[PDB]
Each structure stands twice: as structure tokens, then as C-alpha cells.
Amino acid sequence: VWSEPLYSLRPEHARERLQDDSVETVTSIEQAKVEEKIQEVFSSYKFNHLVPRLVLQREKHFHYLKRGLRQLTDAYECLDASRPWLCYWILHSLELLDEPIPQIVATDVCQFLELCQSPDGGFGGGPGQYPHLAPTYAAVNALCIIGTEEAYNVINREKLLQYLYSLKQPDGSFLMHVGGEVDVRSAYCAASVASLTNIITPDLFEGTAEWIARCQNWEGGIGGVPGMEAHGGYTFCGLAALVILKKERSLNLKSLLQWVTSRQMRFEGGFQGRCNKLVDGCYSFWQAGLLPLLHRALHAQGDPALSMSHWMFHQQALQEYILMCCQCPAGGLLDKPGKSRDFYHTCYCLSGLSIAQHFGSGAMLHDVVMGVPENVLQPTHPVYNIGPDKVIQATTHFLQKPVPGF
Amino acid sequence: GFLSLDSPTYVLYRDRAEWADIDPVPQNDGPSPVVQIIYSEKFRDVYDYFRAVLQRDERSERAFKLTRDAIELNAANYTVWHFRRVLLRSLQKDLQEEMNYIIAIIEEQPKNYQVWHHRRVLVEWLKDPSQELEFIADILNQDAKNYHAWQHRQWVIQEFRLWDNELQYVDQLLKEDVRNNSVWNQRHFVISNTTGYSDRAVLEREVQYTLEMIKLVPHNESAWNYLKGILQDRGLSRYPNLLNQLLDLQPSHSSPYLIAFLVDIYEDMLENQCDNKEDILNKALELCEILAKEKDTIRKEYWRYIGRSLQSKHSRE
Numbered sequence: 001v002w003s004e005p006l007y008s009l010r011p012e013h014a015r016e017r018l019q020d021d022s023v024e025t026v027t028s029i030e031q032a033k034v035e036e037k038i039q040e041v042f043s044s045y046k047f048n049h050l051v052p053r054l055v056l057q058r059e060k061h062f063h064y065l066k067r068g069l070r071q072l073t074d075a076y077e078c079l080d081a082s083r084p085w086l087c088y089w090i091l092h093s094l095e096l097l098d099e100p101i102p103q104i105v106a107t108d109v110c111q112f113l114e115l116c117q118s119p120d121g122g123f124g125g126g127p128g129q130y131p132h133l134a135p136t137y138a139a140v141n142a143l144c145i146i147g148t149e150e151a152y153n154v155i156n157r158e159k160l161l162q163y164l165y166s167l168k169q170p171d172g173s174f175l176m177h178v179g180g181e182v183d184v185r186s187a188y189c190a191a192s193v194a195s196l197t198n199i200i201t202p203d204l205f206e207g208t209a210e211w212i213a214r215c216q217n218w219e220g221g222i223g224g225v226p227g228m229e230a231h232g233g234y235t236f237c238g239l240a241a242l243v244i245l246k247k248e249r250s251l252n253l254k255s256l257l258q259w260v261t262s263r264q265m266r267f268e269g270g271f272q273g274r275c276n277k278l279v280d281g282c283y284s285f286w287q288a289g290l291l292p293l294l295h296r297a298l299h300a301q302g303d304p305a306l307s308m309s310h311w312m313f314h315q316q317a318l319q320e321y322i323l324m325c326c327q328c329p330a331g332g333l334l335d336k337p338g339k340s341r342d343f344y345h346t347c348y349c350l351s352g353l354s355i356a357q358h359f360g361s362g363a364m365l366h367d368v369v370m371g372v373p374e375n376v377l378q379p380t381h382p383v384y385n386i387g388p389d390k391v392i393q394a395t396t397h398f399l400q401k402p403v404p405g406f
Numbered sequence: 407g408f409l410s411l412d413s414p415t416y417v418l419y420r421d422r423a424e425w426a427d428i429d430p431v432p433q434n435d436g437p438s439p440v441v442q443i444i445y446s447e448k449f450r451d452v453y454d455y456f457r458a459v460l461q462r463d464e465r466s467e468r469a470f471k472l473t474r475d476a477i478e479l480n481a482a483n484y485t486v487w488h489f490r491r492v493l494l495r496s497l498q499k500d501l502q503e504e505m506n507y508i509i510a511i512i513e514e515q516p517k518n519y520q521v522w523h524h525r526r527v528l529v530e531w532l533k534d535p536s537q538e539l540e541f542i543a544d545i546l547n548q549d550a551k552n553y554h555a556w557q558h559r560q561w562v563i564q565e566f567r568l569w570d571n572e573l574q575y576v577d578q579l580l581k582e583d584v585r586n587n588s589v590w591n592q593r594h595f596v597i598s599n600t601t602g603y604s605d606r607a608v609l610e611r612e613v614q615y616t617l618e619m620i621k622l623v624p625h626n627e628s629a630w631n632y633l634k635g636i637l638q639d640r641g642l643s644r645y646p647n648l649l650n651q652l653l654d655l656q657p658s659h660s661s662p663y664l665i666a667f668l669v670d671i672y673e674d675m676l677e678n679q680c681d682n683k684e685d686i687l688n689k690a691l692e693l694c695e696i697l698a699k700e701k702d703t704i705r706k707e708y709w710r711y712i713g714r715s716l717q718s719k720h721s722r723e
């Protein structure tokens with residue numbers, strides 16, 4: 001009768017608090033701060049003398065999202081060059097919560113992204129803005145989430161491929177936009193839109209796998225460009241691009257596995273983006289989404305020691321972190337408690353929650369759903385972070401046409 | 407930049423007589439918008455007029471001053487940065503005052519990507535890195551882990567070959583915060599691009615340094631990751647004293663990182679056909695078990711799997 005179901009609330013969990021060896025630095029001071037704050041969230045139940053249960057506040061989240069899909073206050077002025085991102089974050093959050101898109105909203109998004117599309121290929125952050133690979137990725141994913149004939153046909157595939165060739169560099173890399181610079185995220189953006197819309201030529205990604213491979217460092221993770229610190233956003237993008245390119249093998253997967261698994265925080269349960277930095281809800285996707293990707297990679301090499309039920313991270317603790325610490329009572333999700341909500345964190349907290357809930361490897365399916373059973377989300381594809389159905393459906397539809405040049 | 411956006415006397419561009427000849431260009435969001443931002447009057451006014459000058463490709467001093475305001479209102483707008491760079495060149499603006507400008511904006515918005523990119527274009531144009539290491543060091547003084555700052559520093563050092571004083575800098579910062587993973591990465595960046603890690607006097611200095619840091623702060627994971635990082639390419643079992651010296655730390659320094667490093671040595675021992683196979687594998691399994699079960703349970707699924715991997719390939723079999 002004295003058995004706590006929530007991993008974060010068990011008495012032995014208090015041992016997982018930071019040991020600072022009596023040597024204080026900014027890093028340890030800051031980590032201790034978060035941990036005090038998180039402990040007080042975990043302890044809330046005992047202190048108020050109530051039994052815990054974890055509820056994903058689906059209705060609050062839904063109203064936050066359905067409203068933002070139409071209209072945003074002057075607080076999102078800082079995202080006026082990222083409007084397709086907002087479409088993608090919001091539509092993906094709605095697809096994870098299993099909310100259909102009124103056919104008319106679908107068509108309004110379509111018409112809007114049409115206005116964002118550049119005549120020379122790709123999409124910009126808003127109507128009449130120059131194109132850029134990030135909003136191009138977001139626009140494509142949003143259109144695939146909608147997944148109607150209308151949506152698919154907004155995309156000008158010929159121009160898209162030209163645009164991608166315009167950004168392609170000698171050393172394997174891609175510019176994020178014309179007159180811009182390169183990082184691993186742009187290669188991922190290019191691989192995602194290229195593979196989904198079927199425009200991969202034999203020479204498009206020549207050198208790209210090796211360029212990405214140069215970004216893996218002494219830590220095992222991947223930095224934004226060669227020589228830079230390993231970081232979860234770039235590491236996710238690096239490995240997922242290589243999965244699309246079928247060059248998973250270009251990396252040392254063993255150092256990569258060891259690095260990402262180390263990024264789960266023993267106390268908080270969430271993931272940090274870099275070693276010795278703070279926990280953050282969005283890495284619930286960037287970091288935890290690496291696990292399904294490494295599973296498919298290592299399994300395809302014949303790793304006989306892989307689990308048939310679980311990803312190689314504490315799925316339970318990640319769910320406890322998101323549900324207890326990352327929900328805004330007004331709707332939306334968060335980096336951490338005391339941060340303010342936004343649509344990016346709403347998208348990636350939900351994306352990460354879904355990954356923590358659904359294991360899949362061959363015929364082996366196994367869910368783990370903390371809290372009430374209605375907490376269960378729709379699954380998401382670990383490479384594209386849209387629904388596995390939207391992915392299969394899109395690839396199938398665009399395989400109907402030839403790679404431009406055929 | 408003649409009239410500041412936060413001036414009490416700031417006036418909308420639509421109320422400025424020196425703009426009376428040009429008609430603003432409203433954003434076209436369509437008959438029924440999605441993700442429609444309800445901009446402030448100030449923001450919309452600037453961007454209506456920015457759309458007008460961009461549309462006409464007006465390469466004028468007034469346009470240049472306008473980009474400033476549009477950037478200040480949304481410094482992530484890469485379209486406006488591109489146009490500002492077209493103007494810098496068309497108007498043959500003094501790039502040194504433009505460096506003074508980017509310095510001030512980066513101080514204010516250090517985590518914005520576009521501002522750092524803009525600075526790199528100017529350094530490239532000027533072919534002059536003379537202010538960079540000191541500027542970057544000021545940013546890092548406010549946030550020692552700023553990713554863009556570290557990237558710009560790496561770029562500057564590499565492109566202009568300015569390696570000579572970097573290791574001193576790293577040692578300053580490592581002393582300020584020995585848990586700063588960005589600095590451990592910088593240390594590695596410098597050494598691998600200068601002396602390298604094969605010079606045996608250097609590899610030993612580095613390993614002695616790290617162990618010395620690990621001893622003062624045993625739960626600092628960055629040092630463990632460095633140590634592991636600088637020894638593992640060659641193979642941990644190539645260094646037979648290493649096992650012994652870590653086992654000696656265990657009594658009074660046993661973090662789960664020490665234990666996990668012990669396991670890494672054992673795996674390399676077993677992979678290089680060491681003495682006592684049936685055995686070393688067992689000692690490591692004891693350790694994996696202790697980790698999955700007791701010392702590092704957040705990673706239970708990882709440590710389980712290492713166990714299963716080591717079993718499947720190193721038992722009597």
C-alpha cells in the first residue's frame with residue numbers, strides 16, 4: 001500500500017539531487033536553482049495532502065492552439081519572419097491531440113503558404129519575404145499534415161529543386177538561405193523537403209553525409225558546424241538527415257548513443273540540450289527523438305541486444321517531467337516552470353511526449369502512458385515530426401511523379 | 407538612426423514629410439488570414455514603408471535608416487538584413503560605423519543568429535579581425551556558454567589563424583567555471599588544431615590536468631567526457647595504468663561517471679582479446695547492474711543494453 005507509482009515522487013529520488021562537491025560555480029548554482037524549483041513541483045501533492053494524478057490538459061491546449069492558428073497578439077511580432085513555423089507548430093500540435101482541421105482552415109493555410117512561396121522556389125517567413133530553408137521545411141510539413149490534393153499542389157517541385165541546388169555547397173553543406181551560412185539544420189531541412197516531395201537527384205546530397213559526419217565531435221553528439229559543441233537540436237537534425245540519406249553509418253553511433261542518453265537529467269526527468277546546461281521541455285523531442293532513430297539504425301545492423309518494448313531512455317520520467325512541469329494552466333506547454341508558454345514549446349513538448357508514449361520496432365508495438373489513459377497522443381514520425389500516416393501518404397503521392405529531370 | 411524608436415518625439419513614418427512622396431505597401435495576408443499577428447501601430451507603419459522601399463528597390467539613405475528601425479522591431483527578419491547589406495554596398499557606407507552598430511545590437515540581442523552573421527559578413531568585407539576576440543570575450547563575460555559567440559570565435563580563429571593565445575583564454579575560463587562544457591570543447595578545439603593529441607608530452611599534460619580537475623570536482627561530467635574523449639580514439643586498453651588509477655579514486659570519488667568509465671575500459675579490454683575474458687566481462691556486468699539498478703537508474707535501459715551487448719559478444723561463446 002506504500003508504493004508510489006510516480007518515479008519522480010519516490011523517496012529514493014531525493015538521492016538524484018545535484019552533488020556539487022562543495023565547489024560552487026555558475027553552472028552548479030543555476031542547476032541547483034532549477035532543482036529546488038522542480039522538487040517543489042514534485043512535492044506539491046504531499047504538501048497539499050492530495051493524491052497525484054497526471055492529466056494532459058487537452059482542452060486548454062486545444063483552445064490556445066485553435067485561436068493562435070487564426071490570430072496572434074503583438075507579442076508574436078518577433079516571429080513575423082517565421083509564420084510558416086507557426087502554422088507547422090500549431091497544426092502538428094493539433095494533429096498530436098487528434099483534432100481534425102476544418103477543411104476551410106486547411107484551405108486558408110494553403111492559400112497563405114502559397115503567398116509565402118517564392119517564385120524562384122522555397123518559402124519565406126511571410127508574404128513577399130525572401131525564401132529560407134527553415135520556413136520551407138515548416139511550410140512543406142504543414143502542407144503534408146493537411147495532406148489534401150490542394151495542399152500537395154501548392155508546392156512547386158521544379159523550383160524547389162532549383163532553390164535547393166542554389167544553396168548546395170562544394171563541401172557537402174547547404175546555405176540556410178542565399179547570402180547566408182551553413183549548419184546541420186539546413187541539411188536536414190533540405191533532406192526533409194527533398195525526400196518528401198521526391199526531388200532527390202543522384203548528385204543533390206553528394207558530400208552531405210561526410211559534411212554532417214565532420215560535425216560529430218569528441219563528445220559523441222553533433223555541433224552546428226565542424227568544431228562546435230555537441231547540441232541536441234543539431235544532433236537530431238544530423239542523424240535524421242543521415243537516416244533519410246541512408247548513411248546512418250557515417251557516424252559513430254556508439255558515442256552518439258552514449259552522449260544522448262547522458263543528456264537525460266537524473267532529477268528532473270527531462271533532457272538538457274548540451275552537457276552541463278539546464279533541462280528544457282523542447283529537448284523532449286530533439287534529444288528523445290534520437291532514440292527511435294538510433295533503434296532503427298542499430299537494428300538494421302543486426303544488433304541482437306535491442307529491446308523489443310522500450311526506447312533507450314526513461315520514457316516514464318520524461319512523461320512525468322512534461323506533464324507535471326511543462327504544462328501552462330491556461331493552455332500551452334513550456335521550457336520549464338516559471339517560463340512563459342509559446343507555440344514552439346507546445347509543439348516539441350507534445351512531440352516528445354508522443355515519442356515517450358509509443359515504441360515501435362517491426363511487429364513489436366508497445367505503449368507506456370503515464371497518468372490517465374486519455375493522455376495518449378497520436379504517434380509522430382521521428383524523422384519528419386509529422387504523423388507517420390501523413391509521411392507515408394505524402395511520399396506515396398509524390399513518387400507518382402518523376403524527380404524533376406525525368 | 408537619427409530618430410530613435412523609443413524617443414518621446416518618435417513620429418510614425420506616415421506622419422513624416424520627407425516620406426510624403428511614397429505610398430506605404432500594406433501586407434497582403436489574403437481575404438482570410440491565418441497566424442495573423444495584430445501588430446502595434448509602430449511595427450506596421452515601419453513594415454508598410456519597408457515593403458514600399460523593398461518593392462521599388464530604393465537604394466537611399468532614408469531606406470538605410472528605415473532598415474535600422476525594421477531590424478530593431480524584428481531582428482530575426484533576414485529579408486531586412488539582406489536589404490540592409492545591399493544598401494551598405496550601394497551607398498558605400500563606412501563599414502566601421504556599421505561595425506560599431508552591430509556591436510551594440512549584438513550586446514542587446516546576443517542569442518539572435520542574424521546579428522552574428524551580419525558581423526561576419528562585415529569582418530569578411532573589411533578583412534579585419536582585430537576587434538573580434540575582445541568583442542566576443544565581452545559577450546562571453548555576460549554569458550560564457552553563448553553558442554553563437556563560441557561559433558564566431560572558432561570562425562575568426564580559424565579564418566585568420568589566431569590560435570596563439572586561445573589556450574590561455576580557455577584556462578582563464580576553465581578556472582572561472584570548470585563545468586563550462588563550451589570551454590572544454592574550446593580546449594579541445596585549440597589543441598586538436600595546433601599541437602594535436604599524439605605528442606605524448608601533450609596527451610599526458612592533458613590527462614594529468616583532467617584527472618586533477620576530476621579530483622577537485624568528481625561529479626563534473628564535462629571533465630569525464632573530455633578524459634574519455636582524448637583517450638578513446640586510440641583505445642582505452644592501450645593505457646594499462648588507467649584502470650588502476652581510477653579504481654584508486656573510487657574509495658573517495660565514486661561518481662556514476664567513474665563507474666561508467668570503468669565499464670568503458672573493460673569493454674576495450676575485452677575487444678582487444680585481453681587476459682581473463684570469462685572474468686573482466688563479469689566485473690563489468692557487476693558495474694552495469696549497479697548503474698541500471700542503484701547508481702544511475704535514469705539510464706536503466708541504456709545500461710541494461712550495454713550488459714546484453716557485452717554478454718552476447720564476450721561470454722564463453
Ligand SMILES: COc1ccc(S(=O)(=O)N2Cc3cc(C#N)ccc3N(Cc3cncn3C)C[C@H]2Cc2ccc(OS(=O)(=O)C(F)(F)F)cc2)cc1
Nearest residue numbers: 078134137185186188189233237280282335342343344345
Ligand atoms: C522568443 O525568443 C526566441 C528565441 C529564439 C527563437 S528562434 O527563432 O531562433 N528558434 C525557434 C524558437 C521559437 C520559439 C517560439 N515561439 C521559442 C524559442 C525558439 N528557440 C529558442 C529556445 C527554445 N528553447 C530554448 N531556447 C533558447 C529555438 C530557435 C532555434 C530553432 C529554429 C528552428 C528549428 O527547427 S528545426 O530544427 O526542425 C530546422 F531544422 F528546421 F531548423 C529548431 C530550433 C525564437 C524566439
Ligand SMILES: [Zn+2]
Nearest residue numbers: 280281282335
Ligand atoms: Zn526550449
